[PDB]
Amino acid sequence: GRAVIELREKILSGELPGGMRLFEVSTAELLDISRTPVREALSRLTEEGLLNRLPGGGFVVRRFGFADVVDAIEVRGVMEGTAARLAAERGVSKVALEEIDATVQQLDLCFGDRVDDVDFDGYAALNRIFHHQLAALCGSEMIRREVERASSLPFASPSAFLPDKANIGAFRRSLRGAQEQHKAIVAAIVAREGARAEAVAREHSRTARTNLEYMIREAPELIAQVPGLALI
Amino acid sequence: GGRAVIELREKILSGELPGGMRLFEVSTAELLDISRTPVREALSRLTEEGLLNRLPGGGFVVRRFGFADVVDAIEVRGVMEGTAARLAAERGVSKVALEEIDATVQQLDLCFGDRVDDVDFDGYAALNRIFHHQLAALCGSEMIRREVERASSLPFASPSAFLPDKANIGAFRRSLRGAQEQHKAIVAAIVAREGARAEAVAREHSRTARTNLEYMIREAPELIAQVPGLALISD
Amino acid sequence: THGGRAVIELREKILSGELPGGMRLFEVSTAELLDISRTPVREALSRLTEEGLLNRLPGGGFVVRRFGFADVVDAIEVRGVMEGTAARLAAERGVSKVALEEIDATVQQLDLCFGDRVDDVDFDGYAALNRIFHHQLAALCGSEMIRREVERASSLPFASPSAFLPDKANIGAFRRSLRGAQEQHKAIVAAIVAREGARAEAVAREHSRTARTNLEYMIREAPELIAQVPGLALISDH
Amino acid sequence: THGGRAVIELREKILSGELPGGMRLFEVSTAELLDISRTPVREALSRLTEEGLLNRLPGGGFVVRRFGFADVVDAIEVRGVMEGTAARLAAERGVSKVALEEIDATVQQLDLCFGDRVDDVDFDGYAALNRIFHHQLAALCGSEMIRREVERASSLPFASPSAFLPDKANIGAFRRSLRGAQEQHKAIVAAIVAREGARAEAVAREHSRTARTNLEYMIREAPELIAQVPGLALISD
Ligand code: NA
Ligand code: NA
Ligand SMILES: [Zn+2]
Ligand SMILES: [Zn+2]
Ligand SMILES: [Zn+2]
Ligand SMILES: [Zn+2]
């Protein structure tokens, strides 16, 4: 319920920092909520990967460094590469293929005549749809939920490195190449080219890594706009 | 908490608590005859393990599995183990971690005799668990170790799942020779910084469990009941 | 040399379709047709067999090799596979400071070909520097055998890295495609520096799909460009 | 034919190391050495340049190509990469019922070369059937260009499937066993049937990568033997 939302907000803002131990009574007091919803909130946020359970009881706010962000992006890329390869090997229905191709055609409409001209917000929304469609493309529920789970951490999400404030020249310029990769993923799946589909979908996740590296080096003010990046 | 986890897992895997059954901490506490505090932890831990799903309106639901789920889970474990192998090959491995896994590989070789059938199956199964735990931790990333171990958390996704004690038969002992050659190649590829090879061999290695599953279905159906949760699957 | 001149002339006659696919060639008849001595012709026939433009027949003579669209696509695929091999081996084995500095310089020069508009691309400069980049990539791991085999896989007129970048292909659609191709050049070098062999191989192999896309664009949208790629106009199943 | 006999004799002399790497060969002096006419010697020297055993010199004539241990390893690497490509393309494009039946028959026949003990292996039977399996794999996708390039990548004596099998057998050089090699043959076919291109490429590449581990063990651990082995004696190191 609302206990999950409030607790999640306090973890993501760094208010409850990594390594902080949390107990049902002391957390219920901190949030000013009953123990029953707090119990559910602590357990749900362990399942989400924001907290770890301690031996002997209680919870601890999970610590994330830059290396964890890079590894989580790498795991999303590996899992998205798996969804793409399995769709290419097993085949995709006419309908599912038509839907993902429609999203790709829609994403092309985000790009103007100059290298800088990109509808950043439209791209970010359509990009989420494309990645959800790719995760479900092979028709396996197990694959879909594992791909979605690898994309569940705030900084591991496909549109995590495209926040509203990152609508700048350098990030927009990068989206052209990223969209060419969306097209190649679909073309490889259609052609039953599993190795290519996996290779492009895995490489595509290096765009978020390259963006993260740009935020660290050239635009540190952007770090705070990425969900989860306030935890680092 | 841990005892509640064990008992609840047993009741799900036996089909006593069938797929689609809604569970609550009060009714589960009553059924297991355990306090609600350990039950609450057991329900949440078994959601993380993938045996239960949380319901939006409260409570939990026992997850249902088909043959396709078993095959996909093994595929995901192999993909993740392939990732651990590639990252250890690209990033490098400490002298100590390398010495430890190599010791496991040397001990695994001692399980094989002169005849194709002469195989210490039980020794192999125990050392195989160690080898796969060492591989998950090899690159030194806690995030990778955690995600590889999670991928191996389903009863049928585990590296040892398709090596139950009763599967100690000719056909299985013969297959272990090639599986051991794959363990050696994984370590050799990592040492040589050959990431593409390390990933390819570790991913292929997981196909051994898929072949074992297919052998159980077609040639030895009596073995199905030896793999946790496999007997419940109807397709 | 007399041998090298016979090679040039004979290659020109094969690529123009003057000596069509399936035509049987012998020393005497080739020497007569080129109006050159038998000694350089013998060398030219053997060198063009090694290049893949002729096949040896059981009997001492040769035959002009016939190519279809499937051959063009497979040749580009083999180049991408071999360039992916050169990239992976450079990433696994390591690259010398000097070789890395040289290929980084080519990548930096290639970036200078791109302007502010998606269309603003120095096409001719890109085509020349692209050849250098691909020669440097073939030699990057330091193996002579690998360099030799990668170069051979890039030896057909339509399998070469700048085959699908003829001077007349300097049009909007091609200039826009070069931006993504250059990002791939950068990623190949970055993956090699990071010892990321799987990534290096994946990007280098994907990079060769740019030529395949250029080919498909020539067939569907710009048929006038087909005749600009050596030997392409001969192919009847485009 | 006179030409073909000159090719065979010259190839034998290069492979044995009798004509070592770096040795310059000229038409008249080579014709005198082999005791053969001018016309067949021209064909032999040109054919062996096309095969990659000789290189042409800038001023005219030929030179026996030098191969060191690093060249052997790189040639096997190129072979594995090309065979991995043949396997992946067969898996992606699909194979006919007939071609699949033929290659599966070869795999079943290869099982017949194994006895109850690890050392109980019919090496000569295995070598012959293995060559067939690799020829069938190269042609499986139906592309003449791919078939041709895979065969070219497998043509150097030390990169050829089934090369030096009795020699490896003598010294226990099957570090990756022949049973493991046969399990890889089965997995290649199974991956192609299943349209699993990434798996087919990975297993076919590993199949050759492990063949190089075996040949490395031999060259390094048996130097006293390789100087008498045709196809290895020519190695310069
Ligand atoms: Na409950
Ligand atoms: Na309800
Ligand atoms: Zn995307
Ligand atoms: Zn294992
Ligand atoms: Zn290029
Ligand atoms: Zn073989």
Residue numbers in the entry:
A (entry chain C): 11 to 242
B (entry chain D): 10 to 244
C (entry chain B): 8 to 245
D (entry chain A): 8 to 244
What does the paper behind this entry write?
Here, we characterized Atu1419 as a transcriptional repressor of its own repression in addition to two other genes (atu1418 and atu1420). The structures revealed Atu1419 to be a member of the VanR group of the FadR C-terminal domain (FCD; Pfam PF07729) subfamily of the large GntR superfamily of transcriptional factors (>93 135 members in Pfam database). Like FadR, Atu1419 possesses a characteristic molecular architecture, composed of a conserved N-terminal DNA binding domain containing the wHTH motif and a C-terminal effector binding/oligomerization domain. We identified the short palindromic region composed of 10 base pairs and a degenerated palindrome bound to Atu1419 and the N5,N10-methylenetetrahydrofolate (MEF) as the effector molecule disrupting Atu1419-DNA interaction, allowing the expression of the second part of the HCA degradation pathway.
We solved the first structure of Atu1419 from crystals grown in sodium citrate buffer using SAD method at the peak absorption energy of Zinc at 2 Å resolution in the space group P212121. Four molecules (A, B, C and D) are present in the asymmetric unit and form a tetramer (a dimer of dimer), which is consistent with the observation that Atu1419 is a tetramer in solution. Remarkably, the four subunits within the tetramer are not identical: molecule A shows large conformational changes as indicated by an average root mean square deviation (RMSD) of 1.28 Å for all Cα atoms compared with the subunits B/C/D, which are more similar (average RMSD of 0.7 Å for all Cα atoms). This is due to the presence of a citrate originated from the crystallization condition, which binds molecule A in the effector binding site in a different orientation (orientation A) than that for citrates in subunits B/C/D (orientation B), which bind similarly. Thirteen polar interactions are observed between monomer A and the citrate molecule (orientation A), which is buried within the monomer, leaving only 26.6 Å2 or 8.4% of the molecule surface exposed to solvent. In the case of Atu1419, the citrate in orientation A bound in the effector binding pocket induces large conformational changes from the C-terminal domain to the N-terminal domain.
